[model samples]
Target: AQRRKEREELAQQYEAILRECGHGRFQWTLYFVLGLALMADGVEVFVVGFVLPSAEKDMCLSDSNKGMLGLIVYLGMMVGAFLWGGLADRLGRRQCLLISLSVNSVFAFFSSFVQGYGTFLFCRLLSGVGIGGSIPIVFSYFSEFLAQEKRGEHLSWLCMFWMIGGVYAAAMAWAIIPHYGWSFGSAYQFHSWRVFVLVCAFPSVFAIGALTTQPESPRFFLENGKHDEAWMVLKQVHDTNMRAKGHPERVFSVTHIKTIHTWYQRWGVRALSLGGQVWGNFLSCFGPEYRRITLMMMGVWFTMSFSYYGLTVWFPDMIRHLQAVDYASGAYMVYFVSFLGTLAVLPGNIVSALLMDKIGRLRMLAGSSVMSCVSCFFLSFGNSESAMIALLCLFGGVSIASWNALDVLTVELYPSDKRTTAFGFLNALCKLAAVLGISIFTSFVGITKAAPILFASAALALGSSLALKLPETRGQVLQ
Candidate 1:
């Protein structure tokens, strides 16, 4: 009784609000908005591959230039991930989100206006910095707000927006980029890709506006020792939920969970120092208890991106190749088949969302990873065009489903205070793997298409097994 009283005095009244409010419309709204934000990110990340072929002629792109273009955004993402992570840890999630979205929208818009290769590359590179930051930060933001019981399911559901973004991009390319007569003189001479880029930027702008209205994370405030601010945010959450559930606003009594200040808030931060808080966080990830898990997850991250980016880039190229044999007509059929591949991702993601929490994140991811890789290996030997397309559809579905499962696992594995930093490093390293995976596959596609698929299959198999080493995190609360 004495301990409880002392705790009530020291801690923010977080437990009270959390217990009373539970999950409601307030949480769902954030999910939908974050989904929209990811949709923009998905488009920004994947759209460039579609634009590459069309713009090659106008920009006089060389083979080497094409390879460089593929790597540029990823390179930018590598650096951005490191820098933005610290900023998020220091500046808070809301501010980092607003900054990333605004920068992404502006750069994407500018990318559409660039006529020269150097300028276009620069814009895309800059835009990638925003995307790199936004991806991990959104995961952090979404995971923090969710109730622990619902976290895995919701995170899986969140990945569906990423699939939607791909579908949206493919549809736009099919509908607009091919039909390009209109031009804005020198500035927008290639009407199709330019218009497509501009349209993609719009969602980021919408995300910025929507996020401005949402409250900063209450948990974040509490973690930083801003007790009054945390209390205010939690009170607002309680009132918001009351209104959402059609009840009048109600008061929540102030209460603390513990009497003593958290080590991180009081002494840990001072000892670690401010500028290297992120650096300190990174070092802590390698502590004896966490080191093995950290290394295992990094392996998973690398191989996952290797297969993911390799296949995403190669899928279109494969379609483009198949179009040559299958289509009695021409190259436009490539986009049509690519559209079908994009469609496959949505159903895949939906299935992933429904089953991940039930099956558990580790099992789901490992099982799907093996299946996706095995499917790819089989695809390399597909006997007929029909067989190839069928396998392609199947592979596309499971690959996306597996990736969604991995994302949930990433959030669940780390504690809240350092989760963003961990995720940021993961993001940066994954992009590096993506660059290597895509660049190598693309380089060898002209020589032999089978090489990339075979390589991706081997990597996925190894990574999946490595991922099995980590503990399962299906229903665990964010620490």
Candidate 2:
């Protein structure tokens, strides 16, 4: 927050910079790039779930093995997130962004070339690490580059790409997988659907291109203690933005906060400090300022990822069973469930975009938590075919609403400039939760109680959400 006097003094001076860099202008071009990167991310994120149905049929991997694959991917994500977050803080944001995307793209292609289950698992774990690194860095960069009112909107749009990915995945499964065998090329011929997985890997090149022209963040520059360079970049943002309307009275009136320089100063000596409060820093996860938020974030991560991936990967098996049990009407019901989920997503995202500010961050987080818990419990009660389909569709719509809201809420918990590090930490933690859910719960029928336990934990998180007490980030813009 800017000091009251600072706000008053520079309020008008900052006008031109704000306008040209405002919500609907050239700034949205950045949003488009972000959306595209996330789309690639979404595909990589969900490919296992999407392709698992067919892959299971062809590969003869059991449900337990499929769940293990999900766990491996997420575990890789957790490791990458931690690495990327530190790199962003130590190196430069643009560098991490470019290198991670390029690497992930290439690795994903390699994943398509795997021979046996072990090789596939090995490639997937590596791919997950790559995928994990890209997202937090991308979101951190975008959130800092854009204004505040538009943050939720930008985030919602990003998540909206996931729904698009789902539709795209379904189409991919429909288009190339059904008619073509999993085998296509060479004497040791490639399976048809594996080729499709390789094909999807190509999108990261376009994402890398998008990242090239993007400038190094002014906030990151400031945090690195190159204060002069930071000011220069900020002025560049002001000039490039304001020049569109023929700049008259232009000033980039961001605050001169001390923490940015402090962080940069402390960065070099970080790893050498053995006797210092390192464990205390580790214990900060359970601190008064963070404990509740930490738990809630963990719960949200666990439940949302669990229910979503569970339902999705199992979709092929469930639908096939439904179709086998009663052919004529069952397939139609499956289609209807998917279509409704896709249709309901836009409104879910739009609602989060519109109401996040008014409802307050705590309320949005808590409400979304409650809604997610309800959606999962609702899924558990289905018995008949119609009941099952209706429950799934409803779960989809409600989950979208909650997910969009909770994701944005998580992003807001940290301060502005630390976007990269914060998101890296956030993604790392969430993916770790995902790995746990995937590994322990869905990995075996021995743990049929996994989903129920996840639901219970999320319900507790929802009730405790109010205690997490975040700043009301409804209308605060980045400095």
Candidate 3:
């Protein structure tokens, strides 16, 4: 009775302290670190385009192998997403973050050194498992720290880094691949694409190092009955945020009472069983009030992943096909156009962030996605290389813009306790769709390009329509 009363008293005090600290450096510090997380995730997703075109030729990868290359990583992602999300909910987000980064970085680094196709696929699959946690956990990590009133806009801003990472991968490919095709003397020859893979993996190492500077989510602490630890995190935010606003000596408003319970500090049955913890977290998302929205979000994630990753992983190969005079510069021409197309994604993300507060997330998402579909429709008629490149840029920019809305929606719609699990479940579905889309494209490229592009356009349009049906979440406080 005494402990419960003390916790209730401390919760009010912590809440009071936050009201004064408001938004400040404490939030932006997280913003920067989590952005690094997304940047690394983006590299993992797109680096294949840089590596695969060259890899396909060098590794003697068949058409089915190419599709499996895409499928396998997301297959790992499917496993990673569900596992990490459940772990984050049951364990600490910080713990899961470390696990995800360590696994991803180690696997991704070794992937560059593989001598055979089977080994390469295995490494990429493990990397996908690590990369899988990136979307659900990073967004949820950032969302948990920010005040609810400001959540939507900040989450929208975080979406920008993924695009920035995509552009970085393309730029690196252009800069490295053509100039460094010189052969190494050893039997295990080093190639430009392998170098690119190594470079992409480095950012995750940086994230692992940087994330230690930040503390665990205060909400997570509070939920776990760790009042003292929760207050400590809350105090860090209060102190830093206040200092940023020139309130260096502000009083420590919360009493110094303490408890450090994490939900993962499981006892009795939960202590012995990982499956029990995961199952409980998984079911939380499907609770009666949440089931409908969870289904809707799942639909949005599936369609978006299908439209985005489906076409994106095949970009270099597509460029190779469409370019007329670049047969000699083959890989260079493919990456060059991809570089230009990637540049368009930055503005699209920036524009959505700028307008999300004003026009609302729904309108922005639906409008951009529909426009992307329109761009896709006309891409085939761009008979000339220059025309096709222009249409590619248009499609790339608008599709990414709609994708940001999807990110914000995940953070806002799900309840905080269950948010990461819900997002993870949805991410698994999204990647499942991605796997299907890429599988279809690589399998059928020999038959007809029109079928995949047409299918992708149709999926984008349908996803946008479904996204429009979900409630608008612009300024609403996150649940």
Candidate 4:
């Protein structure tokens, strides 16, 4: 009887979600606006990169203090992800998103007011609270809002914001700094970098205002038992989508969940236990049930972050010497190279999504590992610039696929209940790796060429790719 009830409820809810998706026809206009707003958020994230190069000179900063400012921002991201993702799960996604957007807007705008080094750093750290909460929840929101068929496309497009943000950061610096210099107000007052920071911040205010009208996700409302409110949100989506399609009216279903998926308990625990420690921290995330998958995935996360970020941190300085005479031009070429790599990665992800049903998971993973090794070996022969760029693109494609493949693998491998925790632990490892990578790598090249360092990173990447033996989740539904 319970099974029957659950099935009926899900069928109802599925139709309802379809209605909300615009009976299969919401206007792209709305989607574009939201996506642009998100891109602005993305811009905010990378803006500092362009500005930071000039921050020390403007702030009278010491060498020891230079990165400390940037570190403040990163530290916040790591800490915030840990605290906020769950909070977003608890608080409404809409509420959390708006609040975060607003905070980011306000703080970023105020960043232009700092004069002293201590004051500037403090504002940056404070601003982190906003960014910390924004990124993941926006991802979760996008997942809930779009239909399954639309999910990958929308996400791919949205992830493209990362690229836009990178460029935005560069462009903003180029346009602002040369004209205005660094000091903005009276000679005794506001700094020029502050003005640049403020100028970048203005967009967030508009974003916050736009999001204010967007209804909260009905799925979230249903999950929380605010069924009446969920229906209203559902109605709004159905109407917007219908208008776009020129439909007068359409049928809608009410999505229902009898209970949260039980997979969480089963897999969360398993992931934590696998290799993190003998006591099994991976398993701990599984809520006493699904520990095996949890442990394996945690291992994958550690490997992915350690290898991916380790090499990326070394990219800037290495490029500094590569044939491009202009530093900016070198940076721009690297970006172009990365783009080609991403094109391969995107197809690679799609293939992984399709192939898990035919190829065995272990074999596919082994193949990727071998490919990764070959790419790195070729990369180690660094003097060949053409080969270097080609291999980066190739690894870029494979590694990107590997990341998406593992992430999808993580959610599937774990039970529903432990899914979030499993992911949380997985990301925690990633950020830790990133922090260490940035910390050690900037110093890696001071004494010698980076070829040896790249070799080490490649070896690690190959090792990690090979180490993955997690189960295939192609057809199996989370229990």
Candidate 5:
């Protein structure tokens, strides 16, 4: 009981220190760096869709093999999400991020040069693993540095980068994949699609470089009883913010941060092995207090990913079919439509950033999900090409809004100790849903085009319902 009190007191003190530091140069810099990392993830995930057609001819990929290639990345992502999330909680967010980004970047670059289907799949799977870890960790890491008041808006801004990445990927595909100018290795037959993949890997490399300049999460350090390290981070934040405001002479007010060592740190290791420790962390999310939220979030993530991926994975194909039937054939028509769809996410992200704190996370999530559901439902009934394109863009906007809300809510719902782990577990469920979505859509869309869109609509409705059940966490302080 005494230790509990001490921990709470220390947390309060840290919150005060964070409030003093304010959202300034340091936080904004962190925001862009983390946003770049998120954008890198977007590029890695979306590039596959654009690459699939070109790769199909080059690699002699069967229909099923192509589907497997698409799903394999998410499979690796599922494992990475679970693995890295837990490790971030145990090891350190910064360290895990550095390692994961390196893994993602290196493997993705290598995949561009691979000779066979098997080798390419293996490399992409490893890259997906790295992508999975970086996504959830970036949220948890960024949230810890923010004051409660600024958390919602800043996090929403961070999500906007994902849309930027999508736009970039689409534009790059339109620019690069259709042209055949750059080819170096005659032995391996390097192609335009290979060049696109290689280009996609650069964002992760840039993100890795940016991450090196940032500090570890002070909350994580404090949670692990490294008071001095936590204080040093907090002090740096304070000094940096002051310097940016033209007051470099200003010093951090808090000189000492009290630490509370838990029994787990002292003896839990002796009592349990590493796997045992990981299992214990997994179970903690389902403990009596968190059980409802955990299950609800899992459902929410599953449905959201299901609907989002079900539509996005096949969006270009849908556009191509529509273009083939309705308009004069243009080589870049599908890519241009997809690029416009991605641009719609910009307004959606801006709306989310604006109203997230005002209207609250749960409301934002539920509202956006409903919008997405409506848009998707109408999309199935779209008779004209223009109507279909409009609805697709609408779905893109509202769906991304829902995603941004969910990202903020997930981080705010958990304490510092378990934030990334909870996110990872939920994200693993998301990747599973994504895989299932792609599989189901591919299987059924051949039978009827409307079937897949209807399925996605139903998923959005279910996710929206789940969102209504979760507690609102706007302006909630990170524990």
Candidate 6:
């Protein structure tokens, strides 16, 4: 009991020291590097769509094979999320992130040179595994550095990088794929599509380079009872932020971090095998204190991903159906409208970032989910192409706010020890939900197009209701 008391007291002192460090060049640098990593994830995930057309022609891909290529990445991601997330809590976040990004970048780069369809698919799957690990870890790592008041808005700002990444991917595809194609030996052809994949790998490489200079989350160290190390990291932040203001010699206020090592730390790796440790971490997420929020957030994530992916996957198909009659630029129109929808996320991200700290995470998430439901409902009834496009953009914007809010809430709701594991579990479930959403749409769209849209709207409504059940986590200290 005395040790527990000491731990709590030390944690409070740590929080106080973080607030003194304040937001400055240090945090901004962390934000840029982490954001770039997120953008790289977005690029990798979305680039597949752009590559599909040319890849299909070159690889002689059947319709089902093409679909498999898209789905395979998520399958890899699902596995990676579970593996890396749990390991992050056991190992260090910085180590896991570096390894995962390296895995993603290397596989992505190598995939560009592979000629066989299977080889490319294998590379993408491995890259997706890397991508999956980074998403949850990035938010977990970023949130740990923030003060309570600044956490919400900063996380929301970080979410915007995903949108930026999508836009970057689209822009790069447009610039490179159509105009540039290099030829190698007759045995291996170096196409523009290959070049696009190679280009996409650079962002992760950049992120990895930038991340090498940054320190591990002080929270992670504190949780593991490495108080001295945690103090050093916080002191580094204090010095960096102070240096930015031309006061490099200013000492951090908290000189010492009192620690009480737990029995778990005392036993260390001898107490459990790797698999046992991971299993224990997974179980702890559903332990009494975390169980309710974990279950509710799981439902929220599932429904959100289901609705979001369902509508998005169907949007282009709906556009194609609408343009079947006399649209000469049907293909180009789809790309343009999709690009517009991607652009819509910018305003959504800004709104979320602006209001997140003020109104709170639950409100932002529930409100956006409701708006997304309304948009989907209206979309089901709309027959006009322009109206459909407008509604689609509206949905894109609001849904992104929901996503941003959820990202913040996920990190806030969990303690430092279990944060990434819980997040990874939820993310894995999200991928499953997305796969189900897309599959259901494909299965039933032939029967009735309105059916899928209405279903997505219903899913959004369910998600909003679930969001309402979660506690408002504004200005809450990381536990």
Compare the candidates by lDDT and give the number of the best one: 5
TM-score of each: 0.87, 0.78, 0.86, 0.74, 0.92, 0.91
Which residue window of length 10 is worst by lDDT in model 1?
7-16
Global lDDT of each model? 0.74, 0.61, 0.74, 0.56, 0.81, 0.80
Cα-based lDDT at residue 283, candidate 3 = 86
Q: Local error of candidate 6 at 283, Å?
A: 0.6
Give lDDT tens digits, candidate 1, residues 260-337: 238768787664676677788788788996788789889999998988787777766665566665676523555566
lDDT of 2 at 329: 57
lDDT of 2 by residue, 1-479 (tens): 45434433333333333454554434566667766677777777667554553454455566555445665666787888767765765567778877778778878878777877777778777877776777777667766665565667667667766566556655655555553434324333333667667667766768888878767776566545666666666666666667665764776666553323388768757755521332333445556866776665665565566556555555444545555657655223333455567787767677777876667656666676567566666656665667766766766666676666666666666544344555676677767655554444433333353354455445435543543455455765543
Clashes of each: 1, 3, 2, 38, 0, 0
> What alpha-carbon RMSD in Å does predicted model 5 have with respect to the real structure?
3.9
- Give the per-residue Cα lDDT of candidate 5 at 98: 93
Candidate 6 C-alpha lDDT tens digits along 1-479? 78557667766776687889988999999999999999987786666544453345445556655467667777788899888898898888999999999999999888878877778889888998888888899999988888887788888888667767766776767666553332323332333667777887888999999999999988888777788888888888989999998888777778677664687885776546766878888998888977899999999999998888777766776666667644755334545775797688889888998999998888898899999898888887677888888888888887889899999999888877788899999999998887788768756644666888889988889888888889887865677
Off by over 4 Å in 5: 1-4, 62-64, 179-191, 262-273, 325-331
The per-prediction CA RMSD against the true structure, in angstroms, equals 5.2, 5.8, 4.5, 7.6, 3.9, 3.9
Residue 452 error, candidate 6, Å: 1.9
- Which is the better candidate, 2 or 6, if ranked by TM-score? 6
| Superposed Cα deviation of residue 405, candidate 3 (Å) | 1.3
Q: Which candidate do you rate higher for TM-score, 3 or 6?
A: 6
When 3 and 4 are scored with lDDT, the better candidate is 3
- List runs of model 2 lying over 4 Å from the truth: 1-21, 60-67, 114-117, 179-191, 243-259, 262-292, 327-339, 380-387, 416-419, 439-471, 475-479
Which should have the higher lDDT, number 2 or number 5? 5
Give stretches of model 4 more than 4 Å off: 1-41, 48-54, 57-59, 146-154, 178-191, 253-284, 322-377, 384-391, 406-425, 450-468, 471-479
Can you list the residue pairs that collide in candidate 1?
A: 8-256
Weakest 10 consecutive residues, lDDT, candidate 6? 179-188
TM-score of 1: 0.87
Q: What is the lDDT of candidate 4?
A: 0.56
Better of 1 and 2 by TM-score: 1
lDDT for residue 226 in candidate 6, whole number 0-100: 89
